[PDB]
Design an enzyme around this catalytic site. Structure first.
Site, short mmCIF file in Angstrom:
data_model
loop_
_atom_site.label_atom_id
_atom_site.label_comp_id
_atom_site.label_asym_id
_atom_site.label_seq_id
_atom_site.Cartn_x
_atom_site.Cartn_y
_atom_site.Cartn_z
N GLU A 1 0.86 -1.09 -0.15
CA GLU A 1 0.03 0.12 -0.04
C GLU A 1 0.90 1.29 0.01
O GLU A 1 1.29 1.48 -1.16
CB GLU A 1 -1.18 -0.10 1.22
N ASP B 1 0.48 4.75 -2.24
CA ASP B 1 1.18 6.04 -2.11
C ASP B 1 2.57 6.15 -1.50
O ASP B 1 2.81 5.20 -0.71
CB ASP B 1 0.09 6.97 -1.21
N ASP C 1 0.70 9.12 2.76
CA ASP C 1 -0.75 9.29 2.70
C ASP C 1 -1.03 9.69 4.01
O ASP C 1 -1.23 9.17 5.04
CB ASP C 1 -1.22 7.96 2.61
C1 LIG Z 1 -6.09 1.19 -0.76
C2 LIG Z 1 -6.19 2.73 -0.42
O1 LIG Z 1 -5.10 3.35 -0.79
C3 LIG Z 1 -5.15 4.89 -0.83
O2 LIG Z 1 -6.34 5.34 -1.31
C4 LIG Z 1 -5.65 5.52 0.23
O3 LIG Z 1 -5.12 6.61 0.89
C5 LIG Z 1 -6.45 4.22 1.47
O4 LIG Z 1 -6.06 4.61 2.99
C6 LIG Z 1 -6.25 3.09 1.00
O5 LIG Z 1 -7.53 2.37 1.42
C7 LIG Z 1 -7.24 1.51 2.48
O6 LIG Z 1 -7.64 2.12 3.80
C8 LIG Z 1 -8.84 2.73 3.99
C9 LIG Z 1 -8.65 3.51 5.53
O7 LIG Z 1 -7.61 4.33 5.72
C10 LIG Z 1 -10.02 2.16 3.83
O8 LIG Z 1 -11.01 3.09 3.69
C11 LIG Z 1 -9.95 1.35 2.45
O9 LIG Z 1 -11.13 0.62 2.31
C12 LIG Z 1 -11.84 0.81 1.22
O10 LIG Z 1 -11.21 0.53 -0.10
C13 LIG Z 1 -10.92 -1.10 -0.07
C14 LIG Z 1 -10.05 -0.98 -1.63
C15 LIG Z 1 -12.37 -1.75 -0.28
O11 LIG Z 1 -11.91 -3.20 -0.34
C16 LIG Z 1 -12.97 -1.52 1.28
C17 LIG Z 1 -13.14 0.07 1.36
O12 LIG Z 1 -13.56 0.29 2.77
C18 LIG Z 1 -8.66 0.53 2.45
O13 LIG Z 1 -8.79 -0.39 3.37
C19 LIG Z 1 -8.28 -1.75 3.21
O14 LIG Z 1 -6.83 -1.66 3.48
C20 LIG Z 1 -6.39 -1.25 4.82
C21 LIG Z 1 -5.01 -1.52 5.02
O15 LIG Z 1 -4.56 -0.24 4.81
C22 LIG Z 1 -7.20 -2.41 5.76
O16 LIG Z 1 -6.47 -3.55 5.38
C23 LIG Z 1 -8.59 -2.56 5.31
O17 LIG Z 1 -9.07 -4.00 5.98
C24 LIG Z 1 -10.53 -3.73 6.55
O18 LIG Z 1 -10.36 -2.68 7.79
C25 LIG Z 1 -9.52 -3.08 8.79
C26 LIG Z 1 -9.70 -2.05 9.87
C27 LIG Z 1 -9.75 -4.60 9.29
O19 LIG Z 1 -8.61 -4.82 9.88
C28 LIG Z 1 -8.52 -5.78 11.00
O20 LIG Z 1 -8.02 -6.88 10.18
C29 LIG Z 1 -6.97 -6.94 9.37
C30 LIG Z 1 -6.59 -8.35 8.71
O21 LIG Z 1 -6.71 -8.08 7.24
C31 LIG Z 1 -5.64 -6.55 10.08
O22 LIG Z 1 -4.56 -6.16 9.21
C32 LIG Z 1 -5.98 -5.33 10.97
O23 LIG Z 1 -4.83 -4.94 11.72
C33 LIG Z 1 -4.29 -3.58 11.55
O24 LIG Z 1 -5.24 -2.30 12.59
C34 LIG Z 1 -5.50 -3.07 13.81
C35 LIG Z 1 -6.56 -2.32 14.54
C36 LIG Z 1 -4.11 -3.01 14.55
O25 LIG Z 1 -4.27 -3.38 15.82
C37 LIG Z 1 -3.09 -3.67 13.90
C38 LIG Z 1 -3.06 -3.42 12.33
O26 LIG Z 1 -1.94 -4.24 11.43
C39 LIG Z 1 -6.99 -5.42 11.80
O27 LIG Z 1 -6.82 -6.64 12.61
C40 LIG Z 1 -7.55 -6.85 13.79
O28 LIG Z 1 -8.69 -7.69 13.28
C41 LIG Z 1 -8.29 -8.75 12.76
C42 LIG Z 1 -9.35 -9.76 12.29
O29 LIG Z 1 -9.35 -10.22 11.06
C43 LIG Z 1 -7.27 -9.68 13.46
O30 LIG Z 1 -7.92 -10.47 14.47
C44 LIG Z 1 -6.33 -8.93 14.14
O31 LIG Z 1 -5.55 -9.74 15.22
C45 LIG Z 1 -6.80 -7.53 14.88
O32 LIG Z 1 -5.62 -6.74 15.39
C46 LIG Z 1 -9.94 -5.46 8.06
O33 LIG Z 1 -10.31 -6.73 8.76
C47 LIG Z 1 -10.95 -4.94 7.01
O34 LIG Z 1 -12.24 -4.81 7.78
C48 LIG Z 1 -8.78 -2.83 3.78
O35 LIG Z 1 -10.26 -2.76 3.52
#
Ligand SMILES: C[C@@H]1O[C@@H](O)[C@H](O)[C@H](O)[C@H]1O[C@H]1O[C@H](CO)[C@@H](O)[C@H](O[C@H]2O[C@H](C)[C@@H](O)C[C@H]2O)[C@@H]1O[C@H]1O[C@H](CO)[C@H](O)[C@H](O[C@@H]2O[C@@H](C)[C@H](O[C@H]3O[C@H](CO)[C@@H](O)[C@H](O[C@H]4O[C@H](C)[C@@H](O)C[C@H]4O)[C@@H]3O[C@H]3O[C@H](CO)[C@H](O)[C@H](O)[C@H]3O)[C@@H](O)[C@H]2O)[C@H]1O
Ligand SMILES: C[C@@H]1O[C@@H](O)[C@H](O)[C@H](O)[C@H]1O[C@H]1O[C@H](CO)[C@@H](O)[C@H](O[C@H]2O[C@H](C)[C@@H](O)C[C@H]2O)[C@@H]1O[C@H]1O[C@H](CO)[C@H](O)[C@H](O[C@@H]2O[C@@H](C)[C@H](O[C@H]3O[C@H](CO)[C@@H](O)[C@H](O[C@H]4O[C@H](C)[C@@H](O)C[C@H]4O)[C@@H]3O[C@H]3O[C@H](CO)[C@H](O)[C@H](O)[C@H]3O)[C@@H](O)[C@H]2O)[C@H]1O
Ligand SMILES: C[C@@H]1O[C@@H](O)[C@H](O)[C@H](O)[C@H]1O[C@H]1O[C@H](CO)[C@@H](O)[C@H](O[C@H]2O[C@H](C)[C@@H](O)C[C@H]2O)[C@@H]1O[C@H]1O[C@H](CO)[C@H](O)[C@H](O[C@@H]2O[C@@H](C)[C@H](O[C@H]3O[C@H](CO)[C@@H](O)[C@H](O[C@H]4O[C@H](C)[C@@H](O)C[C@H]4O)[C@@H]3O[C@H]3O[C@H](CO)[C@H](O)[C@H](O)[C@H]3O)[C@@H](O)[C@H]2O)[C@H]1O
Lengths: 552, 552, 552
Positions: free
Chosen positions: C247, C280, C283
């Site tokens: 990312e 990016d 970001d």
């Molecule tokens: C891609 C885009 O690029 C640029 O445009 C822009 O600037 C954006 O920032 C970027 O978008 C991502 O981020 C934004 C938010 O900043 C989102 O709005 C965006 O999502 C939109 O676009 C996507 C393309 C669409 O598919 C969905 C839409 O809403 C996009 O999000 C995506 O990337 C994120 C990473 O940057 C993240 O992976 C998003 O996942 C969803 O939301 C997160 C919060 C959920 O996180 C839990 O599960 C993950 C497992 O995959 C863990 O990595 C995560 O841990 C991390 O956060 C916690 C709080 C921290 O303690 C540790 C971090 O590493 C979190 O993990 C917790 O829960 C899991 C359960 O599975 C596990 O038990 C861990 O133990 C626990 O800590 C994720 O599930 C999901 O809902 C992703 O959509």
């Protein structure tokens, strides 16, 4: 108690308990403390048994030549090392008590003293730098080879931290993922102060100089041979300061060394400073005109990439050089991006860029070539782009400021003499609405200069000139053209002497048909034989007619 | 076992085994661990016996005043130290919950609280900074002197790493080759947070602040007295952050202290940031107008170097200041080179430069003097060069933006009000072919302003104005001159109303002989008594004749 | 001896003496040495008893999932940690052996291999980045979740130094005053490589990434959730390098995570570099258009601060990005100051700035949007100021270069196509006396362009053109105006063909009364029916009269 003590205490051996360094190394498990000065012989080699050791130095390694460390485990660290030669050599000090460079060979020879610091041992490059010095130096000051060098040989993941010394060097030979960190101002000897050399085995990778500084040394402060950082740019120099290198502050080697290439690819050179090098601040070239070769054993052939056009791909940003006697910033390569380079107050030239299809962004070259040795302050050979170039500080022959004959340049700032600019194209395509603000003159000017016509004379101008005195609230505007190599020879005026009228130049004799350019225009001219103005008229249909314009 | 244990284990003593710090210090051989809080009395002095010790701190040194460390061997290190006062003093907090500075003395007094942090103890300088505060402060908030200071006295090669604390200070007195490394945000007391003071003995050299940060304190965060880095520039501040200094972020002292000079030479100030100082971001002056002295005991006399013209020779590059209440960047000196300075969003002025024969390259002064206390945003007294000067961010009386009356300047960018520029000379000597691009107007303009005539009115212009509407494909070009203090009063036009002709201004009455400037030119003028245009003609031979130009 | 040994030796326990990590942790007093590889189970939790421990790692922690460290005392340090997954996942490598980005989904799928490095595990964001890849990826390459993570949970004052690993992550959860220092190029797994997450408890403060570098990883290299540095700016990223983030290099999170805000305030982002991110470089946004929310639980409501207008107040300076596939530098916020940003050689856009009432100083956007995916190289939505903007390196559709429709801009440099500039206002208010220097042409030009009239055609010009050949010493000056969408259609000339006269355009037919603009001016026009020039005269009193100007 023995069982509990073995579990609860930190393991460290110390050199004071052993007759040789190898005996200490063999006994060590975790820590090794250097708590007594240790005299080593050149080539003395220590085998650390693959152990991951934390070597803490609180005394000196004393010797001419190399102390060679081998078979250190990944993660090993060596802190506080202090290398010192046994010999006190003859050194030159080619600068004055006001920190002016000495360029006269006889004056340089006069500085000779026996010392481990405050100067350096003359090299073959000094024979070029100070012409005549080869003849004038006494025999005891030529061909000296004193360095006390810590050599880390064929190790991975070893870091040397806070190293220092006198006539000191640090060599990583055939190493990978090794770092020279926070060098504590070692004073250099004959060889490079910090060297990553990977002529044998795999190309060096992961090798860095991070932080710290060095002083003196006969050749370059930090240098690389046959390293390639990969696309990941995993290696180079970051956060480093070099003072008074006998050659250059930071060097990527050029040409063949032994049987193969010494060149380097994909390294970082960032956030670093080089001050008072005898040759260059940064020398990031890979092909050298000092020893031209017609092939590149172990590298890309000339048929693939011509001389000076290697795809070196270094990440180069935020560099400062001051006080260079040779060139502040030197490089070659094709397809290079370079940014945020500041070179100031240099006796030698600011920049020497044997680059092609490369981009230079935000370059400042300020008061360089202050001796006038060189032909220019900044030179670029190939077809490059420069976007932002600051020229001229406060220092004032016929040498050019920028000679970049194939380059397109935009955004020069400074009090540059326009006759000393040579480029392929200079343009400000994207300015907004403009104001020219004039201070210390009775006029403001927007001048034009066509370098093909003349590099030294403006070809036309738009002026505003005060009418009467300050606060008159009145000025005249003037549009001028050059004639007979006399700037402003011919002009149209608006509001001269606050008259509210336009003063219009006319042809001083009968105008030839071809004097008039465009249809539906007229050209006034003088008919002395009747004391009248005539008009050569090109009618709307393009045909010529002569009319009487003003009469007695 | 005893013999083998003595060889295989790391030596360290710990304070928990001793009643006093001196008892621990005397027992130590290699390591010393501070594993219990230690209450010290002011002036308590520890003699480390010349031993090269690694002092690891995992508890507090608690006391008002100085804990004094002496006779540490070269290479000694002190890590993790945490100083804390016994007293909780009264502190002021001259900023609001929206981080606006408070300037009203009564509002500042209202912030008083007892705390070891989040503010500072008022000083005599506060009496100047917040006028009237001396009268309004209660007695318990004046004259306080609480600091818990670690003093390294007369040592060489000692480094303090990762230090922190509350009402904390760090003093290196008479030291050389010592460093304050990676300061872990100590919160300051009454004295400077990090001080290298060398008033007695040899000039300080090798003394640095490297990395880290500090917060609060009544006076300057990092400061130097009587240090000289040499031509090697061996000392200064690199990679450091200061927040909310009660005086300045980084200070080189000025004037006499005790019986001798407190000034500094040849230091580095680089890659550092100062935010929200009550006085300056960087104060690199050596002579101060706050306490003028007519001589310089222990330094160059006034006869050799006039006030503010010392050859300070500091290496100054890549500095950032934001939020200063006094001056973002202050200095003096002659022959200085300064580069890559960014000062933004300051209630006080951006830069105050009492410099002569100095060069400033790539300076940005952006939204400073936002309170309007000061006369300008950037001031330069002497004859200097500025090459690249960014002025004006988004903030909008009669105060100047730049007052640099003896300086020659090039490369201003920004929406500066031209009437608020005062320089000796302003010029863009080396631009290429130019385009003026106008957005949000029906015209584009290239204006001229002769500041000797008027600082507030343009004296002439070249305009292009739309004919009709957008997309008409038609415009007229206009060449204008000021008359009677009315910009654009007199003008020549080309293609007004898409007429394809030139509109030519004429003298509205009979032209005087002296109205015409050049030979082989004519000046049209109005003869109302015959409804005709006449021409005052200066013939090719320079003699005047009047002709009839247009008639009924 | 037992009594003396307990006093004179350093205390350290080592993992080789214990069956579990908790057993070692319980025994430790001062040091803990990891001297054997340790296989941990996901969620394995170690309680360090509040002890201030120095944990030295010389072996691996091996496991998928999280190794959780709890109850470490303030001042604890963990050095040399190496995390490694047990699983070898399927990774994509969307770049070629010439380091060109792959954008075609089928080509990306073709790169699939099983490895712990040299690529990353596909995420849901890849489905957007490489359209069609969701369908083309095999099942074993989707939904993978391999990371070996060191989790520091609910600790204060803990530092992780020189960490590395394979498929490695580092998480600080609910921590304060913690730092990730000198990261030794860990190769990332599925989760962020370095994360400070403070969704529960107090807002994170004092949390930094300082120095070091990372490579690969499926998501962002360094990221923050719910941190606020305070006015003191106590947290952020300084001196860091990110390579090939799946990312972004450095991310401040946007939107709600769980039940509360993930946003961040008052952090530093300085002296850092991001190279080859898939999305990016930096970001620094707080509201995201990728997942729009209509409220902000736990943060400021939309009613107080509209979307993208949070008072984020980050300290942002001296950043470099190269090779971004998405946006080099992205942010939002109101009232922001940003300085010294360099973005170069990016397949994606250079900058995407959803900012309002913000100031950008010394921005360089050089050869970005090189693929042409995006609408522009730099976009700004709101009403901002840009002071210094370098555009165009050496790379050449209809996409804009800068689209900043509400912004006022000054100081563009580079070979920008003027038709690809869109701003509210562009101006150079403070230039000095000007010279336009032309190279490689027979003319020099000062052009005017009124973008409301035409973005693609200059509306007028001041030219100087050579008369005859080079070295003729002669040129003519030309003042032009556009007509019928033909640049330079109508012009006045001075000294054409070295004639020393002014060539004056006249109306090609009978001039209408309204063609003349100003009083005391005349407008020549053609009367074909008598082969004469007439003059439409606006007399000094403003009334019109027609006169005969030139006759047969
Ligand atoms: C891609 C885009 O690029 C640029 O445009 C822009 O600037 C954006 O920032 C970027 O978008 C991502 O981020 C934004 C938010 O900043 C989102 O709005 C965006 O999502 C939109 O676009 C996507 C393309 C669409 O598919 C969905 C839409 O809403 C996009 O999000 C995506 O990337 C994120 C990473 O940057 C993240 O992976 C998003 O996942 C969803 O939301 C997160 C919060 C959920 O996180 C839990 O599960 C993950 C497992 O995959 C863990 O990595 C995560 O841990 C991390 O956060 C916690 C709080 C921290 O303690 C540790 C971090 O590493 C979190 O993990 C917790 O829960 C899991 C359960 O599975 C596990 O038990 C861990 O133990 C626990 O800590 C994720 O599930 C999901 O809902 C992703 O959509
Ligand atoms: C001066 C000029 O300034 C700038 O223009 C410019 O940008 C140039 O880079 C710079 O030129 C120098 O470097 C270029 C190559 O980059 C040369 O082309 C150039 O030489 C030309 O100009 C000279 C002025 C002419 O006299 C000759 C002409 O070809 C010039 O080279 C000179 O400086 C070099 C240092 O920067 C170097 O000293 C050159 O020496 C020759 O070439 C080197 C490879 C030989 O090196 C062995 O002997 C040296 C003893 O003097 C050792 O320092 C050296 O160790 C180093 O490299 C090894 C591989 C590494 O492991 C450790 C390094 O410190 C190397 O040492 C090995 O062999 C010796 C044997 O004596 C010893 O046994 C060591 O144990 C062993 O490791 C050198 O002998 C000589 O042939 C010099 O010409
Ligand atoms: C405010 C202004 O902002 C910017 O304009 C500008 O750029 C100026 O630099 C700055 O002005 C301050 O500094 C300049 C000199 O650089 C002064 O000229 C200026 O003073 C003028 O303006 C004031 C507003 C007027 O009131 C007076 C006028 O002359 C102004 O000085 C003021 O601030 C200084 C701090 O930056 C300092 O506090 C000045 O105090 C006087 O001068 C100092 C030298 C005396 O110092 C001893 O006592 C102090 C106790 O308050 C100690 O902090 C100090 O220790 C420090 O220096 C020593 C040498 C070093 O070893 C450790 C340092 O922390 C020093 O302490 C020694 O003596 C005391 C005795 O009380 C104690 O025993 C210590 O143990 C011992 O080490 C001070 O007493 C006083 O005379 C102040 O006026």
């Amino acid at each position: 108690y023995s069982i509990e003590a073995d579990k609860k205490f930190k393991y460290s051996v110390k050199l004071s308990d052993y007759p040789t360094l190898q005996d200490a190394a063999s006994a060590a498990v975790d820590g090794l403390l250097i708590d007594r000065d240790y005299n080593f012989y050149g080539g003395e080699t220590v085998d650390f048994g693959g152990k991951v050791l934390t070597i803490e130095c609180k005394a000196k390694f004393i010797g001419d030549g190399n102390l060679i460390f081998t078979k250190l485990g990944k993660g090993s660290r060596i802190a506080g090392v202090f290398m010192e030669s046994t010999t006190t050599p003859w050194v030159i000090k080619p600068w004055t008590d006001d920190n002016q460079w000495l360029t006269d060979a006889a004056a340089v020879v006069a500085t000779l003293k026996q010392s481990k610091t405050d100067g350096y041992q003359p090299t073959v490059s000094d024979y070029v730098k100070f012409p005549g010095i080869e003849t004038l130096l006494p025999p005891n000051a030529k061909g000296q080879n004193i360095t006390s060098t810590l050599e880390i040989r064929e190790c991975i993941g070893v870091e040397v931290h806070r190293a220092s010394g006198l006539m000191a060097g640090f060599l990583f030979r055939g190493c990978h993922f090794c770092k020279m960190v926070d060098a504590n101002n070692p004073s250099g000897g004959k060889d490079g102060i910090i060297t990553f050399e990977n002529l044998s085995g795999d190309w060096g990778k992961g090798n860095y100089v991070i932080g710290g500084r060095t002083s003196y040394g006969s050749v370059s402060s930090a240098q690389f041979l046959r390293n390639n950082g990969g696309f990941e740019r995993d290696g180079g120099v970051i956060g480093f300061t070099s003072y008074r290198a006998g050659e250059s502050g930071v060097k990527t080697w050029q040409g063949t060394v032994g049987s193969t290439t010494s060149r380097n690819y994909n390294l970082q050179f960032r956030d670093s400073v080089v001050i008072y090098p005898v040759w260059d601040g940064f020398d990031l070239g890979a092909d050298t005109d000092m020893n031209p070769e017609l092939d590149r054993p172990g590298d890309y052939p000339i048929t693939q990439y011509p001389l000076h056009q290697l795809p070196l791909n270094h990440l180069i940003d935020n560099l400062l050089v001051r006080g260079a006697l040779g060139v502040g910033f030197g490089m070659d390569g094709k397809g290079m991006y370079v940014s945020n380079i500041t070179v100031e107050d240099c006796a030698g030239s600011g920049a020497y860029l044997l680059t092609h299809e490369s981009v230079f962004t935000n370059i400042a070259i300020i008061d360089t070539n202050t001796k006038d040795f060189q032909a220019n302050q900044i030179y670029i050979s190939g077809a490059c782009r420069v976007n932002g170039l600051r020229l001229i500080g406060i220092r004032s022959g016929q040498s050019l400021t920028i000679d970049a004959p194939n380059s397109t340049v935009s955004g020069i700032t400074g009090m540059v003499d326009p006759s000393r600019i040579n480029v392929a194209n200079l343009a400000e395509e994207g300015l907004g609405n403009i104001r020219a603000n004039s201070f210390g003159y009775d006029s403001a000017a927007i001048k034009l200069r066509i370098h093909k016509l003349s590099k030294t004379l403006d070809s036309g101008a738009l002026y505003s000139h005060i009418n009467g005195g300050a606060g008159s609230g009145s000025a005249y505007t003037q549009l001028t053209a050059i004639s007979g190599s006399t700037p402003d020879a011919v002009s149209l005026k608006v509001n001269h002497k606050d008259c509210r009228g336009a003063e219009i130049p006319f042809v001083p004799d009968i105008a030839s048909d071809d004097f008039i350019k465009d249809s539906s225009c007229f050209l006034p001219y003088w008919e002395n034989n009747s004391t009248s103005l005539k008009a050569l008229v090109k009618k709307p249909n393009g045909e010529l007619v002569r009319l009487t314009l003003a009469t007695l």
